[model samples]
Target chain A: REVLTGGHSVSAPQENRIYVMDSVFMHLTESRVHVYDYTNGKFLGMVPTAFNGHVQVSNDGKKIYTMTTYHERITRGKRSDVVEVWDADKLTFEKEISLPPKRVQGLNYDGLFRQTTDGKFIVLQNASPATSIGIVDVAKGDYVEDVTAAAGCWSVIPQPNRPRSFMTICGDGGLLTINLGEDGKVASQSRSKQMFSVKDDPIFIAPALDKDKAHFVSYYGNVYSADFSGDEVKVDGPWSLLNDEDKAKNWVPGGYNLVGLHRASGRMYVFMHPDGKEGTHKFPAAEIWVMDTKTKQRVARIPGRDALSMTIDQQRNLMLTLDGGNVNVYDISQPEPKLLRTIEGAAEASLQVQFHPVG
Target chain B: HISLNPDLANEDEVNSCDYWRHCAVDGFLCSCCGGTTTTCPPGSTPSPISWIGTCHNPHDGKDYLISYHDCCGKTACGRCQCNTQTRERPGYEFFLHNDVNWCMANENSTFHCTTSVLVGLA
Candidate 1:
């Protein structure tokens, strides 16, 4: 079948295959390793991981890692930190690398890896009480450096085709960008003129190639497109997807507010809770609204029991979704809808869906 | 006037003879025979052995009063038989009583007493 499904929660493209972590097979207990496969949807098995909170594949797609909470043997207390190099294709178990101790809970790949123009590194955002940014050496499997910032650093996006540069949003204040040195370490940090007072929520930082501008989405469902190369940061309108007056009625509890834009397909999937009052009914099963980034119009809507996280398989032209207890595979190649197949028994609250290519 | 010898009476070619008469004793009935007056002693404890009179020739209307002991005899008590002395059917009460009590005394008895009695009568 074109659609191969099944994972507790899944993450997006890593190493040419779909890498799933913390699957149901772990009995819903905390699992530190991530499972991998070939890009054609072949099952490759699992590797031990350091962090259970969030995992991201390296920029070169050679290694995968996460930031997790681990109990300190000396202190006998759990510390939010980073773990790296637990597994790789070349080596089964690499030496574990640790990061500056903090309550780190979320991670993301900058989607931009450069070596000649700039060194390659993975960017991670801390979602715990304090906000910060950290980069790891993909080749050496170690944390290079991190810088502190205002609270509410939800997500980070690196400019595609650019070297040593990335952007992030702060929950307390404005958008910030960081540039790395020739050694892949943090060289400088600055606030972008595209500033908006927003809450600590997940933000999307996307780069526009033609305009050399970066797009930003706030936790409040406000979308802003800004130009970063100029002396003054050019800010666009804070467009709203759902009407402000209907925000309360359409708000789905425990659902993610932001949508990750698929640069290839020009489609954006915004996750929202099912429509209903909380406590009056069961939590809205996760529902996603598909919007065209250019037109900024809602194009299609897919409803499911628990649509936790999703990833696009660019090669297969499929949108892989982690529903309540199943991995839903939808063929997005054609305008008409086509559901290839479903892999059942994978259920979790927060899920990562990744499609890694197979060599 | 009366035949005293039992053997001489047997060879006398008598026209009539007494076989046996069937009677009831205890809760069971049997065959018995006698002439003029057939009586069971008050405390004799009636048994299958009884006296019977038979007529050898019906035309003469005369018969000999023989001490016929066919009722308690093995032939009449256990099975059916045609009486040669009386030249008539013998009473079947002896056979009936014998067949009825046969099972009670013999554990291996297979014959149903009521069926045996009806078959004998038919």
Candidate 2:
């Protein structure tokens, strides 16, 4: 047996330090954020925030903006809304901005942290009685407007070409695209047809760029993709990838739903379950299906049960799959992917992964 | 002497009784005959019958009576006797009442009984 060793744990790395939100810590439930170095894999320290939500690195990779929840220590009150800004390089606290009284949920790690195309503002989803899209002035630290939307706004994406942006469906059934006016308020809102209705809540939305095309997949094995320029939205079939026929032949049920996606090389890599359902469903294994965006065809299939979450380091030409508490890097440059390295237990939920360019 | 209305004894009428009990579960009384018949409007199944069993019209948090029926020997027989010959017949073998007022007037009407069988001829 080949023994593979020498990787970092939750501790801080000696080289490129990685910041992770530790969902379960003494201060909060998956609320405290931890920073570790990639070189030595040593625990540097935890951030001073009382609670942490979703986190995203800035476009320039200089800062980290996290949707945070914390109660004032003096008041000992309930959890409130706030976004914590951290200086990524110095690993120091920056400034905290107050969000609406409602809980700040559903954070998406889009490439850019602030929306500057139309104007300088930060966009986030506020999930309270229902999910609503909120815009805030990053410089002023005040909420600009809140637009009532579908019941659950899981993630928000500013349209790449347009001035004001639209939010995709999270909890509710259909997609809602909002056009913002110059004043940073919603000028118009449109919903997709019922056929495009999302029956289940989506965990993430991977917007396809020019090289990849815009597409979003649900945790329950539904994928939708289309061009954003058209007046009407065209969604492809809600394909059922579950291989129950093969499972029945072997006296076993097919896998659970597809959980996430990573777009690269004009191909979307969908991470799904090999076991039909969790628990009572036998061993939990994940299968990866590579589908072409242009042709809308299945290019390849890889069966591996160990993967939990995945992210692409496009600069390095590598696909990183966080499998069984280990980061397995696969070389996608070749037709047949080859294993590069495995970093063990990198981060909780293994939410986001990126490789900084070396000068 | 007993007087039975055959119009109220047909299988269509008796079947209507069975359908009514199956529909009126959730405090809904039979609207077809007003509160007189406690059943769901035609063509819908009762969602889930409660622990207290199914009721037709439950008013003031209580289920009120709707319709009742009983069978006696021979059609048009004036005597109030069990219809032994046709009692075991598979089809509609029981008398039926469309409303509580009618049921209260019938001497043979069985109170609090959705369905029952009287053994041997009286």
Candidate 3:
């Protein structure tokens, strides 16, 4: 005799639940979104996605969305792309909204696909070898139009309060803000002045979003702040990420999606390495530096690991990092972050880790 | 025709990072993962799409385009990791980027190793 258990729900609590999107390259067609109870380090359940699929939890925590691809044949033949919606409570597939076949096929990055602040529309990045963005109106459960992002722009950074507007980083080191009308069509678009030099120094694509602004750390350790709240997006900063002593020692930030923000505290944690150089920009962190966004100063330094990506859950005071195939959970309630637990083999080669949105 | 120091320029070896076609290559060389400069290993498939870039062939003193594709359906080769971002752009510019998994377009997109094949003259 066997006993059957009822399916679990991720909507119960926001603090303890963490969602991991994995490409699982070896079995790429069976890529999955792994759910976990971070507090207990317990495995909850996983939802299957397609090759290089990107996943996100709905703002209301009632649905989980994934933009994935499928082939009519096992590995070849006719191909189809769709945005599959999963029930957050049962972790079961609900419905799929069809999309064009040109979604960007790349590693899992947070900015690749994002929902507007109001959760009415999903802005997705697309590349036919040329760049573009697709708008999906989730409220209406239909795919909207694809807008041509200027020649060399990338990453969709959705505005805070304005659901119809979002920003993208251009090759010239500025932002291209796109605004949509009530019908989910392109209304107007504008470009901000060059904020960082793309040739001399380039900023990371994934930035730590704080309310109305985004804090981007450069390869050489400067902060570029972009405010997208106002009528016009404003760019500021060349602020240093290193103190005089650290700068003298050649300590600089590194790694993919390397910055994490504890929004409640106004502090951003950056992964840094010493003796940094050109080719070493993608190197893993040797130490974690805490910076105060307001004061624009370093407040503390904590021991680090081979971290590649990170995200902080303010409600739980928990910070999670992905390195190799492991997840390291740290308690950031105190000044110095303490390693709480390590979940080994979280994903074979995952670079993104996100916490459930708070209600 | 043999010389005292027959190198990659003449012998055309693909195992090392100094191979002429590897100027913009960024992952483990497929030559070290049971494949040649243009073919995938025994159990893997060559990616349909690749990140294309230009590389300087010092031997001919000319520039040529190279399509760097990753082998799919296997775990990372973890051998002879090589990274050289010659004209690579940030993630924003997907076509000129190398850090991304080109296997994304394949059925079994797990990254095995990378292949650098000559496309044409620049």
Best by lDDT: 3
Model 1 per-residue lDDT tens digits across residues A127-218: 22344666766667677766575244444656554576766654434557677886667777777653554323323332322224555554
lDDT of 3 at A110: 86
Best by DockQ: 3
- Model 3, span A1-359: residue lDDT tens: 99987665654455577888877755556789888878777777888986678999998888899998777664556667889889876899999899887787776778888988888888898876577889999978888878885557888888876867888999889999988887789899999998998877778888888778888998789999898777788999798888898888899887777998888888899999999865567678898898889898888887677897898877778889988588899998876788989888888778888887885
lDDT of 3 by residue, B1-122 (tens): 12112233343465777776787777788877777776788889988888888877776687888888889766667777787766666776666788677876676545788877778788
The 10-residue segment with the lowest total lDDT in model 2 chain A: A251-260
* Regions more than 4 Å wrong, model 3: A5-14, B1-13, B16-28, B32-34, B39-67, B70-87, B101-113, B118-122
Worst 10 residues of 3 chain B by lDDT: B1-10
TM-score of chain A of 3: 0.94
Q: Between candidates 1 and 3, which one is better according to TM-score?
A: 3
lDDT of 2 by residue, A1-359 (tens): 89887432333322354555443312222455566544444556555544335565554456667766554441133445677777665657678888765544222244213353444566775544344667776667677887775344444655656766654553334456777776677777777663345323232345534322356554444556545567554445455433465345332111222232334466666664543321111123445666665566656667654564455555555565544245556776643466665666665433344343221
Interface DockQ of candidate 2: 0.01
Q: Taking the candidates one at a time, how many backbone clashes does each contain?
A: 35, 23, 2
What is the descending DockQ order?
A: 3, 2, 1
Chain A TM-score for each of the predictions: 0.71, 0.73, 0.94
Q: Is the docking of candidate 1 incorrect, acceptable, medium or high quality?
A: incorrect
